């Protein structure tokens, strides 16, 4: 015999913050020998980028 106009809130996530990292700076930094040693590993951090 009666009706109620109810209101509800529904929350869904949309997206997260984009994060960009680099192999050379994060792993060791400015070491040239570290870069030379990492160059022999291949393109792992290129694939990560």
């Amino acid at each position: 015999t009666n009706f109620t106009i109810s209101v509800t809130t529904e929350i869904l996530p949309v997206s997260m913050t984009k994060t960009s990292v680099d192999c050379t700076m994060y792993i060791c930094g400015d070491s040239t020998e570290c870069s030379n040693l990492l160059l022999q590993y291949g393109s792992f951090c290129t694939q990560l980028k």
């Binding site: 680099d22 050379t24 700076m25 400015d30």
Partner: protein, 50 residues
Amino acid sequence: TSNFRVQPTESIVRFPNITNLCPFDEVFNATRFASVYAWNRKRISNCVAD
């Protein structure tokens, strides 16, 4: 493609001043030496080690 970096040139400030000589000859050229069970310990600090 890559990252941007700034090249370095040269240092800024030195170590503590080094103008002495570490007496390494006290433990190297000694008149008498000690035994294995009771050796001698000499603390060497605040000097230049060669």
